[PDB]
Design a protein around this ligand. Structure first.
Ligand SMILES: [Cl-]
Ligand SMILES: [Cl-]
Lengths: 116, 10
C-alpha cells in the first residue's frame, strides 16, 4: 500500500467508527499543563467529528478508538481505562479497540491531511 | 475495528 491508499482506507473506516476522548489525566500536572492537554483534546474531538466524520461516544467501552490524555502505561492500575485496557489485552478473541495517546492521535490526524 | 490497518503510514 501507498500513503494515498492507506489514507483512503482509513477515511472509509473512520465513517464507521465511534471515538471516545477520556476525562482522566494519568498523572499529577499543573493547572497550566492540564489546560494545554484539554485544549488539544478539544481540537482532536472537532477533527474526528467534523473532518474524519466519526461518531463521538461518551462511553469508552462503546468505542473503536480511545483518545487518552497521556500514554496507557502512565495510567494507574486502579484506573477504569487501565483495567479495561488490561482486560482487552488478555482476551485474544475479544472485540479490539485502539488506545491512542493524544501525541499519537496528533501524528495520526496530521498523516490524514489535518496538520495540528 | 480490525487490527490489520496500521496507525502509522506505509
Ligand atoms: Cl501523549
Ligand atoms: Cl507519541
Amino acid at each position: 500500500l501507498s500513503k494515498s491508499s492507506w489514507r483512503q482506507e482509513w477515511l472509509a473506516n473512520l465513517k464507521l467508527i465511534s471515538v471516545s476522548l477520556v476525562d482522566e489525566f494519568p498523572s499529577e500536572l499543573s493547572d497550566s499543563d492540564r489546560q494545554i492537554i484539554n485544549e488539544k483534546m478539544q481540537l482532536l474531538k472537532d477533527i474526528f467529528a467534523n473532518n474524519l466524520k466519526s461518531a463521538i461516544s461518551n462511553n469508552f467501552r462503546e468505542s473503536d478508538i480511545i483518545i487518552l490524555k497521556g500514554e496507557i502505561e502512565d495510567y494507574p492500575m486502579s484506573s477504569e481505562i487501565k483495567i479495561y485496557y488490561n482486560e482487552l489485552q488478555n482476551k485474544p478473541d475479544a472485540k479490539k479497540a485502539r488506545f491512542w495517546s493524544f501525541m499519537k492521535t496528533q501524528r495520526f490526524v496530521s498523516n490524514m491531511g489535518f496538520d495540528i | 475495528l480490525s487490527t490489520e490497518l496500521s496507525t502509522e503510514p506505509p
